[PDB]
Structure 1
Amino acid sequence: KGEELFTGVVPILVELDGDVNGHKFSVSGEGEGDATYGKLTLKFICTTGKLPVPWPTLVTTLTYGVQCFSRYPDHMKQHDFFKSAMPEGYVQEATISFKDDGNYKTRAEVKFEGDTLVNRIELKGIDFKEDGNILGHKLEYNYNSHNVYITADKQKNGIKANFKIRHNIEDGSVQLADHYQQNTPIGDGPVLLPDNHYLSTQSALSKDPNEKRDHMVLLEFVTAAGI
């Protein structure tokens, strides 16, 4: 059973390759997750130089693959798809539509590489406005608390996730970002197909005072609820 691999602290590696309106970039993430408390401590670094998009627009993409660290209460343990697909893992597909702007289409794979949870991501962003909230860097360096609504897809032997992200613009306004996530297992083994529920997410963004590269330090708490 996959949940037995998450009883303690597990090291995490996130590698992202992106392209938004022709602007190519790479992000490397390192940290750890402790599913017993739904705790994620991560540090993401843009290894290609300056990030052409604001850091908050990438939080869901960079934390999507680590939803296996969500704290599922004991009474909800039969509803944990994420941990059940482990060690073999799952393929991730997401479409992030920014209101009155472009979209991000992501393809990722999350699995165990030894005793390390790895998330390899490819991001493709198109039709973004030059002086928009994204390419114009008009978004505040913060992240609002939200829910990730999960539904099962028995035909694909996986799950779906739907939620709205409201990014805070510097003028006090809001930039809506609708998310549609789809997860399909890599392995042939049995996975847990859940009833409708949600993941309550709280995220705190910060900077490392001694780090000179474009980066993002993240403290995140994810908890399953609804059942």
Structure 2
Amino acid sequence: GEELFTGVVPILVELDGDVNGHKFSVSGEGEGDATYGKLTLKFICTTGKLPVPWPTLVTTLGSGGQCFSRYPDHMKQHDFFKSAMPEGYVQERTISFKDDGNYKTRAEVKFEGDTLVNRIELKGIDFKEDGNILGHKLEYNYNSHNVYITADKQKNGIKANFKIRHNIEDGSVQLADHYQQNTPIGDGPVLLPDNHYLSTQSALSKDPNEKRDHMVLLEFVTAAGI
């Protein structure tokens, strides 16, 4: 439940991807603090260079940030993510880049000891050869986003819909529409929320001592709407 997130929880993230035939793997480690709604993670591409830009992977790789959200006192009954723990939940997403391809995922966020683990299977198709993604025209940055959550009582889980604004180097913005569905792994009672949002902010940086392809993610997630 929410009892497992009172202190600093260590995180381990693993991702196997396949974008337009290009195969890659990403490892990540870090820690989250639900009291501050903070998440700090370091990702490394274990297969060499990443064939997609790092900003396009933030919501998938940093999906654990949704579990570390600071929910206000009058809202702690709308926290699905924490209530699904230790057994966790299965997450499936469809990220649609406007005028380009899409990413289809299958993720699992659960507890393995004192460590929260996020394992993802990603498949990307229909990307343009010299488009914003495969052409690496995205700036190494990120903007704020609100994750609009609604309950799916039929499947005992939740649904989420949101838009990500990716800044391009020429001045344009690349829209990435997100569709999300979560369902618990366990049979025990989970918290089914009313309509609300997760106010999320993401800051990206580099580690000047890491020679490998990496990304440092600092995320701040707070709940609101009710």
Q: Normalised by the size of structure 1, how large is the TM-score?
A: 0.99
**What is the distance in 1 between the residues matched to 2:202 and 2:86?**
26
Matched, 1:216 2:211: no
**What is the distance in 1 between the residues matched to 2:35 and 2:173?**
34
Alignment of 1:36-51 (within 5 A): 36-51=35-50
Post-superposition offset of 1:65? 3.3
Post-superposition offset of 1:204? 0.7
- After superposition, the C-alpha distances for 1:165-195 in whole angstroms (9 at most, x for unaligned) are 1100000101110000100000000000000
Alignment of 1:1-227 (within 5 A): 2-227=1-226
Moved more, 65-74 or 113-122: 65-74
**Does the Cα contact within 8 Å between 2:12 and 2:117 map onto a contact in 1?**
yes
**Does the Cα contact within 8 Å between 2:33 and 2:68 map onto a contact in 1?**
yes
Deviant stretches of 4+, over 4 Å: none
**What is the distance in 2 between the residues matched to 1:8 and 1:175?**
37
| Local SS of the residue matching 1:65 | helix
| Local SS of the residue matching 2:155 | coil
Post-superposition offset of 1:207? 0.2
Q: 1:40 to 1:65 in 2, by over 3 A?
A: closer
**What is the distance in 2 between the residues matched to 1:154 and 1:65?**
23
**What is the distance in 1 between the residues matched to 2:14 and 2:83?**
23
**What is the distance in 2 between the residues matched to 1:63 and 1:195?**
24
Post-superposition offset of 1:66? 3.5
Post-superposition offset of 1:75? 0.8
**What is the distance in 2 between the residues matched to 1:82 and 1:62?**
16
- After superposition, the C-alpha distances for 1:97-151 in whole angstroms (9 at most, x for unaligned) are 0000000000011100011000000000000001000000000000001100000
Matched positions, count: 226
**Does the Cα contact within 8 Å between 1:78 and 1:194 map onto a contact in 2?**
yes
**Does the Cα contact within 8 Å between 1:12 and 1:33 map onto a contact in 2?**
yes
- After superposition, the C-alpha distances for 1:59-85 in whole angstroms (9 at most, x for unaligned) are 000112331101111110000000000
**What is the distance in 2 between the residues matched to 1:158 and 1:138?**
36
| Local SS of the residue matching 1:72 | coil
| Local SS of the residue matching 2:210 | coil
**What is the distance in 2 between the residues matched to 1:114 and 1:219?**
24
Moved more, 151-160 or 57-66: 57-66
**What is the distance in 1 between the residues matched to 2:193 and 2:16?**
31
**Does the Cα contact within 8 Å between 2:92 and 2:107 map onto a contact in 1?**
yes
| Local SS of the residue matching 1:125 | strand
**What is the distance in 1 between the residues matched to 2:182 and 2:172?**
32
Unmatched segments (≥5 aa) in structure 1: none
**Does the Cα contact within 8 Å between 2:65 and 2:221 map onto a contact in 1?**
no
**What is the distance in 2 between the residues matched to 1:172 and 1:28?**
31
RMSD between aligned residues = 0.6
